[PDB]
Design a protein around this ligand. Structure first.
Ligand SMILES: NC(=O)c1ccc[n+]([C@H]2O[C@@H](COP(=O)(O)OP(=O)(O)OC[C@@H]3O[C@H](n4ccc(N)nc4=O)[C@H](O)[C@@H]3O)[C@@H](O)[C@H]2O)c1
Lengths: 330, 330
């Protein structure tokens, strides 16, 4: 009797209980992305699907699941979705507002601190048991007094600036669209060009989306005209920074270190691609700091993203117009 | 006939060339602590000595070094120098100002973020090659909205608070001395007691020293009263945290994590001392973030500490009362 909702990725147990009131829930009890064949097989008679970023909902998917009334994306975008095929197929598609900006600003500040202060190699040096007290090693660079440029004064770029206010730094920013007056002084930031930002900075933090336009914006050329011994911190998307241009600038001492939350291997919509992170980056524990796309891996934030995709599903199955709907099925 | 100066630990070449104008310098070319015997054999006919945290200057030391006119310590205190012995033997003793504050406050925040966002464990999974793009794992804890608590508002607790101003947290503070009206508002921190701040807090950060009073101030009794699943960040001095009471707090789920830059193991001035950090903490990679007393391991700060040790030596060797003198011998 109950509609069925298939969840393709693990969710908190409260959201499954929330969904059970009006649907029978087929969760993914693993922390693993199931293969597209196993997802389609589960969704085939499902009234609803909660979709995550591995899911690519095309007409092929939708024709394998003719009972689909709603796809509730736990995503802020719809790139991997055929919005009009969902419309043609009488399938509400819903999305959730951006709850990822603060957890990604916070993490970006984490990568900056961990990498400029050698915190990983310092943690390894404690695990090894050889610690006998302070030594004149792992000397890093400080924050106060330094110049850090934000390439991309967006949502993330903003919250970063707001969160470095107390750090007595000198913040620059290179963006296509400038900012107003009040914010530019509120969070003491200054506008400047890419060749000038990139040349006059100690730490470079790109916050631009991935486009057909700006890809490898940080390439061999960009890296060459920065301050020697600078630091590159990349929590935007993978293919914006040339992981091989930094393999060389690492060995040549041009930049002091690279921290990353993303990798070009992480982009399947891209037709250029190595299936692994460069092995020379993965062996350079002394100048690199890496997280596996953990920008929004905060329990509270994921709970709320999940909550909203679940509400979208409960509204659509109830006959209501769902709040995240970006679509009008007939 | 140039006076001789022994430096017990590595210093930047800039400092050596500085001291080379007025003395012959015997440096520690490595990043290691020479043993005492070796320090003594180098300093046995030294006119000056630059001392660091491992050094411990007692009467036996001085009686082995008779030409000694000055000990210029690259430290802000003198707990391991028999000052009056120095006076008695005709040797100046100098220290440097406290310049450790801001680099310590920044590293504390680094320790907070890295622990709560599982970045150590994130890096390992990256270096394991098994990374395959986003997954629903390594969900950590956010800052915004959470309540963090600074036990003691000295210089470093101010710097920590001032820096966290832009992170949308709820900050409390408990020092026995109060803070003035307006700085307490630009940082949005609030007066409360030890019993209060421990009850209401997800993050606890001690920022008081050890003395006779205040050691194992974070003990079983304190850990009995905090929040379940809370975090302890200890980058002020060691032994203010009862490490083994923290080893229980983790196991009983009372603490979700412990990060520290300082240990109990770092104190030979207490009749309670094995030889290491307990390896129940060293094996706990998933709940602990550690660093080897990197509180002030930034280049610009180490350099300037070395320069003031250097200047103090030059001054005394030239017959001047050295600016950092904590004594007056004859
Ligand atoms: N690691 C994560 O987990 C994570 C978390 C959240 C989001 N993301 C993803 O979404 C982006 C974040 O940035 P954003 O602040 O969320 O997005 P936006 O406001 O559009 O960005 C600023 C923009 O830059 C523009 N621009 C400027 C010049 C130019 N030639 N082309 C441009 O395109 C223009 O000015 C605009 O302000 C990337 O991080 C990406 O990886 C990842």
């Amino acid at each position: 009797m109950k509609p069925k909702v298939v969840l393709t990725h693990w969710v908190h147990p409260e959201i499954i209980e929330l969904l059970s009131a009006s649907a029978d829930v087929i969760p993914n009890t693993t922390r693993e992305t199931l293969p597209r064949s196993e997802v389609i097989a589960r969704a085939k008679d499902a009234d609803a699907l909660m979709a995550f970023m591995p899911d690519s909902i095309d007409s092929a998917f939708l024709e394998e699941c003719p009972k689909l009334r709603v796809i509730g994306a736990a995503l802020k975008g719809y790139d991997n979705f055929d919005v009009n095929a969902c419309t043609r197929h009488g399938v509400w598609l819903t999305i959730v507002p951006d709850l990822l900006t603060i957890p990604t600003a916070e993490l970006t500040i984490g990568l900056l601190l961990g990498l400029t202060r050698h915190m990983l190699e310092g943690d390894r040096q404690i695990r090894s048991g050889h610690f006998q007290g302070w030594r004149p090693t792992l000397y890093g660079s400080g924050l106060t007094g330094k110049t850090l440029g934000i390439r991309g004064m967006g949502a993330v770029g903003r919250a970063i600036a707001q969160r470095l206010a107390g750090f007595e730094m000198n913040l620059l920013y290179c963006d296509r669209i400038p900012l107003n007056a009040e914010q530019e002084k509120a969070w003491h930031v200054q506008r400047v060009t890419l060749d000038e930002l990139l040349e006059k900075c100690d730490y470079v933090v790109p916050a631009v989306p991935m486009a057909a336009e700006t890809l490898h914006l940080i390439d061999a050329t960009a890296l060459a005209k920065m301050k020697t011994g600078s630091y590159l911190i990349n929590a935007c998307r993978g293919s914006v920074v040339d992981e091989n241009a930094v393999i060389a600038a690492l060995a040549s001492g041009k930049l002091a270190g690279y921290a990353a939350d993303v990798f070009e291997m992480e982009e399947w919509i891209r037709a250029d691609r190595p299936q692994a992170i460069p092995k020379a980056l993965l062996d350079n524990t002394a100048q690199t700091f890496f997280t596996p796309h953990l920008g929004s891996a905060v329990k509270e934030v994921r709970l709320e993203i999940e909550r909203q995709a679940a509400m979208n599903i409960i509204q659509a199955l109830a006959g209501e117009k769902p709040m995240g709907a970006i679509n009008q099925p007939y």
